[PDB]
Design a protein around this ligand. Structure first.
Ligand SMILES: [Mg+2]
Ligand SMILES: [Mg+2]
Ligand SMILES: [Mg+2]
Ligand SMILES: [Mg+2]
Ligand SMILES: [Mg+2]
Ligand SMILES: [Mg+2]
Ligand SMILES: [Mg+2]
Ligand SMILES: [Mg+2]
Ligand SMILES: [Mg+2]
Ligand SMILES: [Mg+2]
Ligand SMILES: [Mg+2]
Ligand SMILES: [Mg+2]
Length: 70
RNA sequence: AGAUGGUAAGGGCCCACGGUGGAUGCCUCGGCACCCGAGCCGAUGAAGGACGUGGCUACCUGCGAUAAGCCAGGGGG
């Protein structure tokens, strides 16, 4: 993911609420599974997508945590 | 009658070249000594581990299902 896309992701996430954050991680955790399944049958040439999504989820949960922390 | 040399299955000494082996010199990622600096960690779960963790990953390192990494400040270019 591009550095600017990352800022973008953070700014956008930070605007979200916990519930909206949870909904979105679940969606991404789902989108990762598809990637996995594709990676395992040799149909994911674009494999950087996996490291990417995984960190998105991390960023998101990180931010979810931010919110709930105080 | 007499007398003496070429035999090398193999062996010995010497010379040349190799093989084996890893001495010696040079080298140093490491070690050693002293001196200075610094000196506690832990239920907010330590020390130290187990198992995991990479698109493909045996091991080591790093890391913990947010898993060779997440957020932010500073540094740097
Ligand atoms: Mg990042
Ligand atoms: Mg004779
Ligand atoms: Mg002879
Ligand atoms: Mg012979
Ligand atoms: Mg002899
Ligand atoms: Mg020789
Ligand atoms: Mg010398
Ligand atoms: Mg100490
Ligand atoms: Mg430990
Ligand atoms: Mg390990
Ligand atoms: Mg930083
Ligand atoms: Mg910076």
């Amino acid at each position: 993911m591009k550095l600017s896309e990352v800022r973008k992701q953070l700014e956008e996430a930070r605007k979200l609420s916990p519930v909206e954050l949870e909904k979105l991680v679940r969606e991404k955790k789902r989108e990762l599974m598809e990637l996995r399944f594709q990676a395992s049958i040799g149909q994911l040439s674009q494999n950087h997508k996996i490291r990417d999504l995984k960190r998105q989820i991390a960023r998101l949960l990180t931010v979810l945590n931010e919110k709930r922390r105080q």
